[PDB]
Here is the input.
Amino acid sequence: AVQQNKPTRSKRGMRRSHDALTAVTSLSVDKTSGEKHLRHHITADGYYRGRKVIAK
Amino acid sequence: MIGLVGKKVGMTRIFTEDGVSIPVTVIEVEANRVTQVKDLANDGYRAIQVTTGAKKANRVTKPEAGHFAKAGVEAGRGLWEFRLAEGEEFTVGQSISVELFADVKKVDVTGTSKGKGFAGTVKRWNFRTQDATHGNSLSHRVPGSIGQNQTPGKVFKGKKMAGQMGNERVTVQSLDVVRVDAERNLLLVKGAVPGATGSDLIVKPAVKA
Amino acid sequence: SNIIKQLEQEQMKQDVPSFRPGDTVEVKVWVVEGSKKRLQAFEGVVIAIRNRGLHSAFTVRKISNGEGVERVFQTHSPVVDSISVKRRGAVRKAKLYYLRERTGKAARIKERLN
Amino acid sequence: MIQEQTMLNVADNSGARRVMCIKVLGGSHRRYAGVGDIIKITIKEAIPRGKVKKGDVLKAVVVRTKKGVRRPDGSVIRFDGNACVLLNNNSEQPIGTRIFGPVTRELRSEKFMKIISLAPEV
Amino acid sequence: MRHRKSGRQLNRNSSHRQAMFRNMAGSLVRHEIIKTTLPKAKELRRVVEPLITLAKTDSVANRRLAFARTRDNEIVAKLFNELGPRFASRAGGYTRILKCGFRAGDNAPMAYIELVDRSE
Amino acid sequence: XTXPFXX
RNA sequence: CGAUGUCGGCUCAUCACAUCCUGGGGCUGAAGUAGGUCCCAAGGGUAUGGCUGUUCGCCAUUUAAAGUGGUACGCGAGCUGGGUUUAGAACGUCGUGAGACAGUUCGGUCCCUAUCUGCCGUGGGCGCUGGAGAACUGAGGGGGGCUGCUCCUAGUACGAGAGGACCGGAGUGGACGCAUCACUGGUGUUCGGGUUGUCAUGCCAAUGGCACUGCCCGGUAGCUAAAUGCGGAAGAGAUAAGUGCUGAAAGCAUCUAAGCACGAAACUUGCCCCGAGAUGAGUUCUCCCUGACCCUUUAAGGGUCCUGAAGGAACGUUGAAGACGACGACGUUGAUAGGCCGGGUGUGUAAGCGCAGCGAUGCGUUGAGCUAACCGGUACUAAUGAACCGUGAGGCUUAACCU
RNA sequence: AAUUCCUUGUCGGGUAAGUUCCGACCUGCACGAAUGGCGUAAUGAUGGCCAGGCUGUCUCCACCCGAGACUCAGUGAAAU
RNA sequence: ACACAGGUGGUCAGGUAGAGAAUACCAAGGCGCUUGAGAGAACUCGGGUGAAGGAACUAGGCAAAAUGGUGCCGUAACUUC
RNA sequence: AGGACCGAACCGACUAAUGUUGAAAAAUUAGCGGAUGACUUGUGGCUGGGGGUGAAAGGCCAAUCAAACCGGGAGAUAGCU
Ligand SMILES: [Mg+2]
Ligand SMILES: [Mg+2]
Ligand SMILES: [Mg+2]
Ligand SMILES: [Mg+2]
Ligand SMILES: [Mg+2]
Ligand SMILES: [Mg+2]
Ligand SMILES: [Mg+2]
Ligand SMILES: [Mg+2]
Ligand SMILES: [Mg+2]
Ligand SMILES: [Mg+2]
Ligand SMILES: [Mg+2]
Ligand SMILES: [Mg+2]
Ligand SMILES: [Mg+2]
Ligand SMILES: [Mg+2]
Ligand SMILES: [Mg+2]
Ligand SMILES: [Mg+2]
Ligand SMILES: [Mg+2]
Ligand SMILES: [Mg+2]
Ligand SMILES: [Mg+2]
Ligand SMILES: [Mg+2]
Ligand SMILES: [Mg+2]
Ligand SMILES: [Mg+2]
Ligand SMILES: [Mg+2]
Ligand SMILES: [Mg+2]
Ligand SMILES: [Mg+2]
Ligand SMILES: [Mg+2]
Ligand SMILES: [Mg+2]
Ligand SMILES: [Mg+2]
Ligand SMILES: [Mg+2]
Ligand SMILES: [Mg+2]
Ligand SMILES: [Mg+2]
Ligand SMILES: [Mg+2]
Ligand SMILES: [Mg+2]
Ligand SMILES: [Mg+2]
Ligand SMILES: [Mg+2]
Ligand SMILES: [Mg+2]
Ligand SMILES: [Mg+2]
Ligand SMILES: [Mg+2]
Ligand SMILES: [Mg+2]
Ligand SMILES: [Mg+2]
Ligand SMILES: [Mg+2]
Ligand SMILES: [Mg+2]
Ligand SMILES: [Mg+2]
Ligand SMILES: [Mg+2]
Ligand SMILES: [Mg+2]
Ligand SMILES: [Mg+2]
Ligand SMILES: [Mg+2]
Ligand SMILES: [Mg+2]
Ligand SMILES: [Mg+2]
Ligand SMILES: [Mg+2]
Ligand SMILES: [Mg+2]
Ligand SMILES: [Mg+2]
Here is the structure.
């Protein structure tokens, strides 16, 4: 099954009406190191909720 | 008359003196509490609205809490209405126990049927299956043809097709009330009722004779 | 479920004697013979026990006039007046479904005795 | 749970030995006979000087099945094989005169009282 | 269709799962902390904790069993000798997960899973 | 050329 | 004719009614039972097999009935490919022959990832005039609508007798539909056990890997039908054919012209589901927001500063919710998930040790050991205050109250 | 009848029922003797027919283990 | 045409089990096949199990299921023996 | 002894499903026939286009064949589109 007419550029546009990404708004900052990090995730230097977890 | 809101506990059985096993659904019916009356003057129809159970205060909202507060009953897991019937009369804050049913004899029991997800034609509509064998190519559970030819030249609305099945409102009519025990918040009705254990049920006295 | 336990065990028998698959039991069952209620005996080998509280049940197999008759009792039905152990059987297996494929002589199971 | 093509043993001195069910009477599209229902059979095997010969086509009540019978309390009576008792077409009612093997009380059925009155067990 | 079913299938067949988690409970135990996808990490807790639990009672049976699962004596040595008596008095939750972002090469949700004291 | 398309 | 593929089958259907069954009715050469014929009626229902490619037909056996038609002789981007069916081959028949048959026979490639319409599901957006959370009313829409048999009445009415009812009531079935997992069962590659071959963990003992889960015996939770519960209705309204009352036109007669009584599974209701995007955007209850400044073509104007509630949503733990979204639960003032404790359940007496035996193996400790998704508990682990979105009292007109 | 139009010929057998099968008849539309006639043990991925076992072929479908389908990331077509 | 599930002659032949160069498991040796991560819908593909029934399927038992070894005993018509 | 039997290699290609913008311009999987013979295979040679070769299908002669491919006559001719 293939199209009988070439869809319109407008239609392409409408089909993509919903693929905008959503930026996060959910970063937080570790109280004890001040690195940004997703909520509920650890930081790059391995801090989580202030205590230094991990250590690598 | 009015009906109560309960919870589906599970099924078991009551063995009877003369060796019958009655299969029963065990429905919890905590006191229903009237959260609002409605009348002609104010609403254009008479009915009680009721709550039951309890709700984590943190998860009660400002609006909800307002509305509850007014009737002076504590929050409950939800609200449900029952159409009053010329004669029936209640007052805000009134408490209704399962003993409402200490007779009736049969009840209609509404719940939300277990959710099967995206059902295909066979399961959802009892569509009878094509050959497993004898040449059939990729077409065993598939739904067959869905129309005629140019005439319609379309598919008719209401066509039995595959889609969500389950997880919708279902009433089951005229089940024998088996037991009513308010001290224990029990309603035993004979037979299985809609919805998985745990979910809400609406028991109204059966409408059919 | 805590309620349902309450409902179920207040309906359970507190005297079901002991028996295990292999044992030969005689179940005495109430029945209406025409115009008469009356106890009636069913005796055979316990080939299976379904252990579930009020819903507990057992399948008793017996060879009546030439072929098998299995009947699954519901241990707590009033219909079941009494259960009795005529002979303690020695097997190892919870479900004795294989005795079906055995006739007369192969069917026999060692006595437990102990 | 007998249906078309199902083979059954005979439970009487009718002379029939193996009958095949060619019809489940009692309802349009009705698919199974059991408990104590009335099927229509042909005869695939009969003894040499019986009251029915092979090839004969009449009816028969079913009196024993592997699927068995439930009871008001939940329990089940199962049988190792499927058995019926021949009846004659324009009368139902049993051709044989003796009955073999156990039968179940479901046969209380007025017209099958004979069958219970004969017949060893239950 | 899943209703009330436990157990993640990790796009694997039964044996393979079993293999892998055997190979991974051992890892976690040895190193006391490892990094893995968040899904696996969460399953791992189901395999690895009851080994610990088992180990809180030293007997021959229990070691052999802990060898049946795991099949590595170094590891069944550590449970029992170190780990069991470490968690002697704590009722489960021997393990802990720390979500830690996203795998470059495929964007898989990663996490650390660790014994609750490490020190190592 | 051999009956149905295209046997 | 720069391609509109086909008989039958399978699957799925949808209309017509010249109606097969069920319902109502007139006549009958209708005693009853059972028929015949016509009128009304399309709500629902309306067979499996033997043979043949068949449709059909015949035959067997059911059934209340096995309706007749339309829909590209409905339905091949849905399947099938037996019929038809190119190329191989053969018989008969024709032809000197190549060959041919609208004769027969054996064999013989069925592609297409769905843009649009349509359809089934499920979301995102905005709107409904300040914003919000709920519970609703119910315009509209959809579903459903079948029927056997037995018993009573009554062996009565009727009938010479055989036989055998109407009206009404009571049961219990067939087929169909929905729900459910309590029971009976299926499955249960996540539970337990037995066992073959081989490799390994040094060996023994004990285990593990691989061989379809190696092959098997069982089986929890869940899912599920064959399992067990419930349904079709009664009632009401207006009618069809039809039966009539009163009654003229037409001194009589006349169901009709005025007026009045009845009358069916059809219709409108009553039952179940959806349902205010019902833009004609409805009702009710509750909740939240009470700063100023500048500019322009000065108007429902544009901007800035401060503000940022109700609520939404986010993140995490998740669910008998689920393709994804969505919906529901829970986030320490906590049982949401995992673990952990106890119980249950399943399997069916582990290991080790001891005793017996030459040994295989038995017995004791022992209904042992192990035991998933189960029940009852338990903060051990993970569910961090926060962020974002949404604002800051809400147009004009008239009316009614009101100062 | 690989041959028979009429034709599912007729009769018999098998089946509850058999336009096929087998045995028969002869009215051979339109068999026939190396364009070989009729038989024929064995052989056959050869055509037709019956039966035992066997079974999810089917009544009528359920559950389960896996690869796709679905979701996230990377790459990235097609016919029209 | 491709780092293509195709095609391509000869030589070598370990252990256990086995008749075997079949087959299963191994040794030496060589590999996990150049997108992965999750989900656990329909439907498709490829497998396992299935109550009662048992060819009722269908043009047709198509496809499945079933049979399956060794040694003894023992095997009908018919036959060119 | 045997164009002998069963069965791997090897040769083949009866059934089905898959695939059908394939992993593949004919295959994959499960089943299947031959398998000391008119067997099967490597290397090289010979036969050439109205010609070859053919246990005969109009088969095969470089993804083709009721007359190969290449270049030429050549802008064959086309009352057709
Ligand atoms: Mg669900
Ligand atoms: Mg079918
Ligand atoms: Mg195909
Ligand atoms: Mg297929
Ligand atoms: Mg769970
Ligand atoms: Mg994947
Ligand atoms: Mg065109
Ligand atoms: Mg076209
Ligand atoms: Mg009409
Ligand atoms: Mg006429
Ligand atoms: Mg057509
Ligand atoms: Mg096609
Ligand atoms: Mg043909
Ligand atoms: Mg498609
Ligand atoms: Mg189960
Ligand atoms: Mg050993
Ligand atoms: Mg291995
Ligand atoms: Mg394996
Ligand atoms: Mg008059
Ligand atoms: Mg509603
Ligand atoms: Mg436990
Ligand atoms: Mg719990
Ligand atoms: Mg302001
Ligand atoms: Mg003949
Ligand atoms: Mg037949
Ligand atoms: Mg000739
Ligand atoms: Mg001559
Ligand atoms: Mg010849
Ligand atoms: Mg040959
Ligand atoms: Mg799957
Ligand atoms: Mg992608
Ligand atoms: Mg590669
Ligand atoms: Mg290659
Ligand atoms: Mg090999
Ligand atoms: Mg890899
Ligand atoms: Mg199987
Ligand atoms: Mg079965
Ligand atoms: Mg069986
Ligand atoms: Mg059989
Ligand atoms: Mg048929
Ligand atoms: Mg047939
Ligand atoms: Mg086959
Ligand atoms: Mg097979
Ligand atoms: Mg040979
Ligand atoms: Mg092959
Ligand atoms: Mg061979
Ligand atoms: Mg050569
Ligand atoms: Mg070629
Ligand atoms: Mg030429
Ligand atoms: Mg040329
Ligand atoms: Mg020239
Ligand atoms: Mg030219």
